[PDB]
Symmetry: C3
Subunit: 150 residues, 3 copies
Amino acid sequence: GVRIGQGYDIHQIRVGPPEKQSFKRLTIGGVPVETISVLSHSDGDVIFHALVDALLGGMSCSKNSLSFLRYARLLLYKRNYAIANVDIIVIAEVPKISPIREEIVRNISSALGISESQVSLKGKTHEQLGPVGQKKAIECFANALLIRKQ
Amino acid sequence: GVRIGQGYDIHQIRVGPPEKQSFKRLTIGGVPVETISVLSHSDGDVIFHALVDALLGGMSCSKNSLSFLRYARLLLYKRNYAIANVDIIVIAEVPKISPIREEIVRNISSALGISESQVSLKGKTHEQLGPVGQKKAIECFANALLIRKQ
Amino acid sequence: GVRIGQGYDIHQIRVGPPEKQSFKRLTIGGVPVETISVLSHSDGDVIFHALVDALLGGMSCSKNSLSFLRYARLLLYKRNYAIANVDIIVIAEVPKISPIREEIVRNISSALGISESQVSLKGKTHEQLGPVGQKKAIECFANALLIRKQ
Ligand SMILES: [Zn+2]
Ligand SMILES: [Zn+2]
Ligand SMILES: [Zn+2]
């Protein structure tokens, strides 16, 4: 009883502060970035969205996305799975991930009831290439390993 | 004896019905989509191709791609591995994955001799960005966990 | 004690021989490709970079990149983890991966102290689409499974 899960998300961004879909303040990993706007239906959290998708995929299931991340916590418990670890990559020209990394990791640890040592997070630029390189978009690939209790 | 596998595929598409490589009726997850054409050597199944690649990668190995997926089934048995689960992401503006999801999942379950509950499949748009966002391409990332028998 | 790790890298390339960042001879998987230049700070090894990132992510940690790959070897031993396997995808119009695949696999086996049978490597083109399809870039997605000793 070991399972892999995988998730992906992309949103269009703009470098302004902000002032179906509209341009709002970026949220990423539950962390506001008041200097970037995001085009989204929801809060447009590429990290929480792709991570939530990773955890449901691990279990062969399908605006504030902290809500989704807490439900995933309850679904994992209902289905008898524990997280071994999760590993997250943001591909983004901006924002830099390093300054807010400890915070995001804390937001994810917390919300899923795991330790900070079960969460890895890394930012890569797109080397100024394509929509992501030109600051038009951000994406996230998230991976989860799950273990059947117990 | 636990192994990760990973695979990737991209093909150029056009929104027409169709009428080395040529434009044909799209196949995705073994499911025809008569309203999209695909540029391919083979049937151009981004799902079966990346999934087959995931399962060989799991095992450190290298026109109808259902054929490849059945051989992978025999190679896994020859090499003494079972699939724990597989998790698949299609990144495509079109086609929508939801309408054909149950069918694809059935085609994959069947062909590999696993249950529908060991297969996860999810569609994401590319938020209208780049060749994929403009309906010029579709891609797929596939993940596999394997377990040594027995 | 089983862990997933994931890594990603992209660099701008040019098809010339070459004669913060500058254009140099491409290195990929520790293998020089004297017919392609790479834009990089370091040697610009998309494979060693993303693989190193995969192995640290597996462990919830953060110019010659063979050096990074050897440290990862020591960090894994210090943290009491063994590699089950690694699976690598290069997405590149050029170079072809097949000719240099055995060599790269040998460079990775060697440097991490695992067998060639624990390493999978695969090249995909980007079907001539976008910066990667136009030979402006190359990328790599790397996956690792780790197992607690012992
Ligand atoms: Zn989203
Ligand atoms: Zn193909
Ligand atoms: Zn690099």
